[PDB]
Structure 1
């Protein structure tokens, strides 16, 4: 029985940390290329 993530103030920024939206999108840093290269393929053919 969990009783947390409760805001006691009318201002939304007084709430606790937003710790329920873990999203991992590494492609914008790891594969930031136009031509999607398959793993099994030689990249520069």
Structure 2
């Protein structure tokens, strides 16, 4: 196969990349993932807050 040496190998992007050489960083970018996690930036709070209840009672 190819000696896999890229920047994104642990958690990677989609499997449509094209390559003709033996090193994996020569490959194209391809199309990207649609994965996202918002709640570790918009809700970094220990005790969970519900939208219905008062948050400070």
Query: What is the TM-score with the length of structure 1 in the denominator?
Result: 0.71
Partners of 2:52 and 2:27 lie apart in 1 by 47
Q: CA offsets, 1:11-38, max 9 Å, x none?
A: 1111111533221101010001101101
Structure 1 spans left out of the alignment, 5+ residues: none
Coordinate RMSD, CA, aligned: 1.7
Between 1 and 2, higher relative CO (CA 8 Å, sep ≥ 6) is seen in: 2
**Between Structure 1 and Structure 2, whose CA radius of gyration is higher?**
1
Runs of 4+ in 1 over 2 A off after TM superposition: none
Aligned length: 42
Provide the TM-score with structure 2 as the length reference.
0.60
